[PDB]
Structure 1
Amino acid sequence: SVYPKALRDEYIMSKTLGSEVKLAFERKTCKKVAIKIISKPALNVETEIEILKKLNHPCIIKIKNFFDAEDYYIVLELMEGGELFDKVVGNKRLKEATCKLYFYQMLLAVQYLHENGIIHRDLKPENVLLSSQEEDCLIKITDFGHSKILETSLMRTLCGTPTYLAPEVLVSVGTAGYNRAVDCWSLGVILFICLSGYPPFSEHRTQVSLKDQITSGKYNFIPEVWAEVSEKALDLVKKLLVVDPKARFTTEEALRHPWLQDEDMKRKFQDLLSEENESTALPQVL
């Protein structure tokens, strides 16, 4: 098959980056972009586009253009560093200071989403992108297909008498409003993987079921591997891998954790930030 005419009109398509995501060039600027192809569905796409249009944050990918045709085409910022996944697969591990730089950006991004009433719901190494091939770089969150936009139903229900209201609804009031905490769990797992080169929950060399490990919260701790890692880092992971969503660390609490009170790391991030902004900085009023 071929690409839609409206797309071909503005962009020159190119190689596959991930088998789907393609490299392409905007004709007007000769600049590199990334184009995500979603085969026809509608719903996930509708929300993803609507989310990407309204969000504006350095650690969240930006949408440049959209094409609704034989298939869906979403035009995004090209992230040259690729997926974080490819940096941690094959038991590869990142140096702790890099985990801190990356994770700090993940936390800001996800905090920003929660502030804006959005739950990602699919945080994984694959949906985290690096801006460059340098190991010191900006990261951006991607893939909002599974996202949720924020209990209004329950809220309406609590107005008025529960004369006819079922018990399980009232019981659900306790935990109502903590859906965002699933993102913090996911962050916890990502941080674990990054620090250790291996996953906290798997079926490899174990007879307890994946489900069971997770609900129990008994992650596979391998002291050999973790001796390399700080006690501060490990502590943060522990407060994110908390089974009770009400007790689990929020992004704010993670951001205040001692492991993240690291002025050098922050400085380096600011550095990479303004360096990215140089491209677009208009002179301003003194």
Structure 2
Amino acid sequence: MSVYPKALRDEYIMSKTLGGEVKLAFERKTCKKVAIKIISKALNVETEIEILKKLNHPCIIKIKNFFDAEDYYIVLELMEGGELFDKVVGNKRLKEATCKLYFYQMLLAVQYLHENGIIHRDLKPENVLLSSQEEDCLIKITDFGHSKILGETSLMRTLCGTPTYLAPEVLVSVGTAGYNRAVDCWSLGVILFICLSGYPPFSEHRTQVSLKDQITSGKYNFIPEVWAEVSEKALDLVKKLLVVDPKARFTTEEALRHPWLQDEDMKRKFQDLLSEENESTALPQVLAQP
């Protein structure tokens, strides 16, 4: 077989494989469970860690440690409920209220990413982790391997000069520049569609039109019998995220302002899950005195 590097074994007791490969481990210092992501041997790994260290949001996975050996070892927090994929696999569908609670968190997470100049680019049910086995739980976005950092573009520098020698396709690209983040909103629309209905909107199963053609036209597979169980507001949101034009597509802010997300009961349940997890971390408070 092979062995774990000495530096890792020093701080962690390695255990069972959880699914790159992810292993269960125990931090020796605390006796607490962690998840260790093993990445076989680089440029994406450098960016991934850098992104993970900068982010601080309750709906985004946190990096605990990192080891650079024969393979890369990213120590992450352990999520007991596993992937959202396992709750939707086959034709399993979540209760609409459960969809809302998880979707709201996904929007807050993606909104936080976009506010911080990060595009995930790989949002899918297998990259959404649940904090517990209970259906009302906190969710965390993970797997920042395909992610991209937004900064000052070469296009922005190109536009500071005279376009005497500049090609027309560069000038045509100015119309869409800065809409890259809209790929996350499309992905969010696909996750929401799956969660609400139990089936994917674009599939090669029981159809002639190519997957490519179903996507570029945005003609999702609508099954009325399945969707009758779902509210009009929920479907209206899916429809606004599954828009072909990335400039007309709903952003995370527009999705958060949508009537389907104006649910104080869902919001209170989320605030209740937050404070319950924070209860262990919470240091005493400097309180005002009259």
- Normalised by the length of structure 1, the TM-score is 0.99
2:45 corresponding residue in structure 1: 45
SS at match of 2:169: helix
User: d(CA) in 2 for partners of 1:172 and 1:152?
Assistant: 12
2:233–2:260 CA contact under 8 A, matched in 1: yes
2:94–2:196 CA contact under 8 A, matched in 1: yes
User: d(CA) in 2 for partners of 1:224 and 1:101?
Assistant: 24
Shift of 1:99: 0.1
2:190–2:242 CA contact under 8 A, matched in 1: yes
Shift of 1:168: 0.3
User: d(CA) in 2 for partners of 1:166 and 1:123?
Assistant: 34
Shift of 1:160: 1.2
Shift of 1:152: 1.5
Matches within 5 A, 1:1-286: 1-18=2-19, 20-40=21-41, 42-150=42-150, 152-286=153-287
User: d(CA) in 2 for partners of 1:191 and 1:235?
Assistant: 11
User: d(CA) in 1 for partners of 2:144 and 2:188?
Assistant: 16
Structure 1 runs of 4+ with >4 Å offset: none
User: d(CA) in 2 for partners of 1:152 and 1:279?
Assistant: 43
SS at match of 1:173: helix
CA RMSD of aligned residues (A): 0.6
User: d(CA) in 2 for partners of 1:46 and 1:234?
Assistant: 39
User: d(CA) in 2 for partners of 1:159 and 1:261?
Assistant: 43
2:79–2:129 CA contact under 8 A, matched in 1: yes
User: d(CA) in 2 for partners of 1:13 and 1:160?
Assistant: 56
User: d(CA) in 1 for partners of 2:159 and 2:280?
Assistant: 51
Q: Deviations over 1:220-275 (max 9, x none)?
A: 00000000000000000000000000000000000000000000000000000000
User: d(CA) in 2 for partners of 1:134 and 1:106?
Assistant: 18
User: d(CA) in 2 for partners of 1:263 and 1:156?
Assistant: 45
Shift of 1:90: 1.1
2:128–2:142 CA contact under 8 A, matched in 1: yes
SS at match of 1:187: helix
User: d(CA) in 2 for partners of 1:190 and 1:264?
Assistant: 22
Q: Deviations over 1:42-93 (max 9, x none)?
A: 1110000000000000000000000000100000000001000000001000
Q: Deviations over 1:123-145 (max 9, x none)?
A: 00000000000000000000000
User: d(CA) in 1 for partners of 2:200 and 2:94?
Assistant: 14
2:20–2:39 CA contact under 8 A, matched in 1: no
User: d(CA) in 1 for partners of 2:4 and 2:153?
Assistant: 41
- Normalised by the length of structure 2, the TM-score is 0.98
User: d(CA) in 1 for partners of 2:50 and 2:115?
Assistant: 17
Shift of 1:98: 0.1
2:20–2:38 CA contact under 8 A, matched in 1: no
Shift of 1:19: 7.4
2:20–2:37 CA contact under 8 A, matched in 1: no
2:107–2:255 CA contact under 8 A, matched in 1: yes
User: d(CA) in 2 for partners of 1:73 and 1:193?
Assistant: 32
Q: Deviations over 1:3-36 (max 9, x none)?
A: 0000000000000111711110000000000000
SS at match of 2:214: helix
User: d(CA) in 1 for partners of 2:48 and 2:81?
Assistant: 23
User: d(CA) in 2 for partners of 1:155 and 1:126?
Assistant: 35
Q: Percent identity?
A: 100
SS at match of 1:50: helix
User: d(CA) in 1 for partners of 2:259 and 2:77?
Assistant: 33
SS at match of 1:270: helix
2:91–2:198 CA contact under 8 A, matched in 1: yes
User: d(CA) in 2 for partners of 1:11 and 1:236?
Assistant: 44
User: d(CA) in 1 for partners of 2:166 and 2:47?
Assistant: 32
Shift of 1:284: 1.1
